[PDB]
């Protein structure tokens, strides 16, 4: 089909000249003669019937003049119920060594976004079981959740815990898109779900599909794996009227990969160094990941915050695309509170007394206010001394510290790290416990009793153990 020839191989950007009709942009080009499959996606019509293409795999071995065919369609991936329990690449190739993925329906990774009249206006609440999330920044069923955080702050652990708590319980299928992450973590997740039962290698009851492009992959591949995963999720939303859970790790890699190829594509660098087409491409991806009126897709996306700078363009743009945001602060993790959710930075759209209820809203706002007042008091402490503050100031500091400790919750996925058994706190118990702490009913209990506990019943019980060991 209009067999082209490679005219230049610079980095991942390969230019092909088509003597016959030029392939339209975003179509997939297959390089002939390579032992494996190398797919070149058209990016620009440079001119003189030449297309600038970004390779989806390594460009080593390419020789000028090599024949390149045109598929005629954007990269098409095997999609359907048969992808569950299978690991697939960006170009939809089985990488689990379990044979070909035999799906009767193929879909292209590139597609238009859902229309405005297809947007749903409902806002439910998803009880993850995490005290910080459910109280301060409640997640919503179908909403777009964002796990903002730096490096080594808890994004991967938190997302795996969310998979364990929600996805396992959720009857609908789930999709995990490992965009630009460590390959070791991908294998860990694959093995963990095998033993957990979410992926069954024997039967056909698997409930989670895996799309992985790790950082070992070339920049081009790392910029489309998210599109492949969301295409699979879209199939599980439109073709099948089911609720889906799309878990993507480090969406930031989607933006970063574009920055690694924009210069070769021929674009003038934008601020800091990202590609000029940052917001547009990010929206094109994100708008597709929504809950239409046909079906719901509750998406949890981990977003790496470069150098813990939220003002960085990549995390900054993604804030507008997410209904519920949970920012993991390194300073809190240094304090030891795990999860390291920043109580005064995390926000959710359903945090509305009409939606979450008056009591829930009041308790959450009280917690946030007391923590703000504690932040204010710390500056005074640094100069005056703790033994100089007023009794009201000391009471506020004590209660705020107790609340901060009670925010910490041991995770089942973190049982290996912390050593404590994982706990899941119901929303009612979370609200009741934080309300009691705000009231002061547990002021007599030491702060240590509130650290790494589940419900306040565990909190008071721990205090008694310490007294018995005193």
């Amino acid at each position: 089909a209009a067999t082209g020839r490679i005219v230049a191989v610079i980095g991942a950007v390969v230019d092909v000249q088509f003597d016959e009709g030029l392939p339209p942009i975003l179509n997939a080009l297959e390089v002939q003669g390579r032992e494996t499959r190398l797919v070149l996606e058209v990016a620009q019509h440079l001119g003189e019937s030449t297309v600038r293409t970004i390779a989806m795999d390594g460009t080593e071995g390419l020789v000028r003049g090599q024949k390149v065919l045109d598929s005629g369609a954007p990269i098409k991936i095997p999609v359907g119920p048969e992808t569950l329990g299978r690991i697939m690449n960006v170009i939809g190739e089985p990488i689990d060594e379990r044979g070909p993925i035999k799906t009767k329906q193929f879909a292209a990774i590139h597609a238009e976004a859902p229309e405005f009249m297809e947007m749903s206006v409902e806002q439910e609440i998803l009880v993850t079981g995490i005290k910080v999330v459910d109280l301060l920044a409640p997640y919503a069923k179908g909403g777009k959740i964002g796990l903002f955080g730096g490096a080594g702050v808890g994004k991967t652990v938190l997302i795996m815990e969310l998979i364990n708590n929600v996805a396992k319980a959720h009857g609908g299928y789930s999709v995990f898109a490992g965009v630009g992450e460590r390959t070791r973590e991908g294998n860990d997740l694959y093995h963990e779900m095998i033993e957990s039962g979410v992926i069954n290698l024997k039967d056909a009851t698997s409930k989670v599909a895996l799309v992985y492009g790790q950082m070992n992959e070339p920049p081009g591949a790392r910029a489309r794996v998210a599109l492949t995963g969301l295409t699979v999720a879209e199939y599980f939303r439109d073709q099948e009227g089911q609720d889906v859970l799309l878990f993507i790790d480090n969406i930031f890699r989607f933006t970063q990969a574009g920055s690694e190829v924009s210069a070769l594509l021929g674009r003038i660098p934008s601020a800091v160094g990202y590609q000029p087409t940052l917001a547009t491409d990010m929206g094109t991806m994100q708008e597709r990941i929504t809950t239409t009126k046909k079906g719901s897709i509750t998406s949890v996306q981990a977003i790496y915050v470069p150098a813990d700078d939220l003002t960085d363009p990549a995390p900054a743009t993604t804030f507008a695309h997410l209904d519920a945001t949970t920012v993991l602060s390194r300073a809190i993790a240094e304090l030891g509170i795990y999860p390291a959710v920043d109580p005064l930075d995390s926000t959710s759209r359903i945090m509305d007394p009409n939606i979450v209820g008056s009591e829930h809203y009041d308790v959450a706002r009280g917690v946030q206010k007391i923590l703000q007042d504690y932040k204010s008091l710390q500056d005074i402490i640094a100069i005056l001394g703790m033994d100089e503050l007023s009794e009201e100031d000391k009471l506020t500091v004590s209660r705020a510290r107790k609340i901060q400790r009670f925010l910490s919750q041991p995770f089942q996925v973190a049982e290996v790290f912390t050593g404590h058994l994982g706990k899941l706190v119901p929303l009612k118990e979370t609200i009741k416990g934080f309300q009691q702490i705000l009231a002061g009913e547990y002021d007599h209990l030491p702060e240590q009793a509130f650290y790494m506990v589940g419900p306040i019943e565990e909190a008071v019980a721990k205090a008694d153990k310490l007294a018995e060991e005193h």
């Binding site: 703000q372 500056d379 640094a382 703790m386 500091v397 702060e447 008694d464 007294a467």
Partner: protein, 53 residues
């Protein structure tokens, strides 16, 4: 005043991570570490009292 001028916020002392921030961090711990001991001892006395009765 003029918005352009750099504006400080609550917690800046601790956020800096300097000597004054560390002093505040340690000072808070030293106070409540002692308070917890008093509270824990009081709880132990309460437990002993209810054991007696």
């Amino acid at each position: 005043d003029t918005p352009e001028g750099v504006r400080s916020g609550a917690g800046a002392v601790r956020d800096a991570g300097g000597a004054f921030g560390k002093k505040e961090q340690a000072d808070e711990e030293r106070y409540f570490r002692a308070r917890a001991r008093e509270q824990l001892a009081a709880l132990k006395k309460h437990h002993e009292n209810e054991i007696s009765h």
